[PDB]
Each structure stands twice: as C-alpha cells, then as structure tokens.
Design a protein around this ligand. Structure first.
Ligand code: MG
Length: 87
RNA sequence: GGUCACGCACAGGGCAAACCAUUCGAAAGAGUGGGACGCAAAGCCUCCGGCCUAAACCAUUGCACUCCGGUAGGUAGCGGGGUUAUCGAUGG
C-alpha cells in the first residue's frame, strides 16, 4: 500500500498557494528530506497537497504522526498516494 | 475626384515598450509625468478564441505531475473580428 508521496486532503482553500507550500514544508520537513511539494488551486486540486519524500519510511512516519492535525484551523487528512510518478 | 483594397515611399507627422517617479488596485494591471523598444491604425470597442489576476460572494472534499469552476477584473502592444482616420510611389 505505501508510497514515497503523501496526499493531504481537506486543506483551507482561502490560503494562498505561495504560503501553503512554505507552511507544509515547515510542518513536514521534520520527518525527512522533501523532494518537492505539489500544490495547485484548480477546481479539482483545491485544498490538496502532494508531499514527495526521500524515503517511504519517512513518508510512513509523517502519516502516522500528523493524522487529523489541526492545520490552518481545519484538520488535515493524510493518506498515501496511488502513484509515485515524477523523477 | 469618390469608393474598396494596398505600403516601395513622400508631406504633416502620430503613438509609446522596457525602466524610473507617483497615484489607484487585494492582484493582474491601469492612470499621470519622464523615457523610446518598436508600431500603417501600437486610434477606438472584450463580440470570439488564447493568456494573466483571484479580494468578496457562489460552488467544490476533489489523486495530481498538458492545463481548465462560476463570478468579476485585466490584456486592444497575443490573435481574429467590428468601427473610424493621413498621404497617395507616372502608385493598385
Ligand atoms: Mg507620456
């Protein structure tokens, strides 16, 4: 089931993409070296983030540690990605 | 002559990119002044397509690595279209 990338759901949509990335990095950088964080604000990709880790284990840690985490008021929803595509 | 096209000019000349100052804006961007990259409509209008912004309301819990809600604003110097205008190469 597990994956290098984690999928974050239910994020506050009123936050700029600019800031959101930086906030997600500060929160998640404590578990491993993030390769990149993908955040779009299109109709489909609103309130959503992909955080690609160095390791799957480091990605397994962040999921098991910050589930439901109150983040910009709203609680985070984390689950593994379905495909780990990209270099 | 006039009309409809056209730009190898000629006459009057016209406009003003970037950048800087200042104002407005949530932003894209616009206004004014300075300033010239260029432009035969780089005068003017968002009807159509593209692109840029996303503060407020509406909608949306959505798995991406083409990119895409409504909504409003912007770009006419991104295209198309519409409309008006100078000269007139023994010009077509
Ligand atoms: Mg001026």
């Amino acid at each position: 089931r597990p994956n290098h990338t984690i999928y974050i759901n239910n994020l506050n949509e009123k936050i700029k993409k600019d800031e959101l990335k930086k906030s997600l990095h500060a929160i998640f950088s404590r578990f491993g070296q993030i390769l990149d964080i993908l955040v779009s604000r299109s109709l489909k990709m609103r309130g959503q983030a992909f955080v690609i880790f160095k390791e799957v284990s480091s990605a397994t840690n962040a999921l098991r540690s910050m589930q439901g985490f109150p983040f910009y008021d709203k609680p985070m929803r984390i689950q593994y990605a379905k495909t780990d595509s990209d270099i």
